[PDB]
């Protein structure tokens, strides 16, 4: 989790003019930046606050109100070493599929670093024994449009010990 500074041109239609400007600006910005992954930034969650809000122009076209807004928004972006606690929402032979709790089913830990009793035999067998911990390793993002996902991340499961659960 980290705060991100953004500047956006928000267009408010005239039928919301009776509303206070800041509230409707926040509502529209949240509607525009919810459950979406900003490239090289991470998955934005919601708006934290609106720091700078300058004058509201009205253009000779649409007739709505366009405002340039400086705001801070919270996003989920680990720092390549953060420790997380997710739940196993699936498992593939080449690697388990852990999902952060109802947050994002994008964490795919490779099984190439645990103690040498590692394999997934397609029966959802996690690990041959000697709340699931995670150490984020690398961030990666990709584009979508290429003709007339985007955050997965790699996960480390070292010899953490895990006295409570193997």
């Amino acid at each position: 989790f980290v705060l991100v500074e953004m500047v956006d041109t928000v267009r408010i239609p005239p039928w919301q003019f009776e509303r206070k400007l800041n509230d409707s600006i926040a509502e529209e910005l949240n509607k525009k930046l919810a459950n979406k992954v900003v490239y090289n930034v991470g998955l934005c969650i919601c708006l934290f606050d609106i720091t700078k809000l300058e004058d509201a122009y009205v253009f000779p076209g649409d007739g709505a109100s366009h405002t340039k807004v400086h705001f801070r928004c919270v996003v989920f972006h680990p720092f390549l070493d953060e420790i997380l606690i997710g739940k196993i929402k699936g498992c593939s032979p080449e690697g388990v599929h852990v999902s952060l709790g109802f947050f994002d089913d994008i964490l795919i830990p490779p099984e190439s670093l645990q103690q040498p009793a590692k394999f997934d035999e397609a029966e959802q067998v996690w690990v041959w024994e000697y709340g699931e911990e995670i150490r984020f390793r690398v961030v990666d993002e990709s584009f979508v449009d290429t003709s007339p996902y985007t955050l997965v991340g790699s996960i480390s499961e070292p010899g953490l010990g895990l006295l409570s659960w193997w």
């Binding site: 005239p14 039928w15 009776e18």
Partner: protein, 76 residues
């Protein structure tokens, strides 16, 4: 505060046009229309009542600006 206190005819035309366009697009009305189905007549009534929520931003050629409220300006 240095420009003309009188509201120019071009300013009136553009303010009325923008206000009528907003009213035609379901913007709130501030003068309690009496059977006026024409947005432009409603905009003219708002201008006469000096209730138009629009601020003109007069731009000087160098780049400097100054803001005048519609109620602050003088109409003819």
């Amino acid at each position: 505060r240095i420009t003309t206190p009188y509201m120019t005819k071009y300013e009136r035309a553009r303010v009325l046009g923008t206000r009528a366009l907003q009213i035609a697009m379901c913007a709130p009305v501030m003068v309690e229309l009496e059977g006026e189905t024409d947005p432009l007549l409603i905009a003219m009534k708002e201008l006469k009542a000096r209730k138009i929520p629009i601020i003109i931003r007069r731009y000087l050629p160098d780049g400097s600006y100054e803001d005048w409220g519609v109620d602050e300006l003088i109409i003819t």
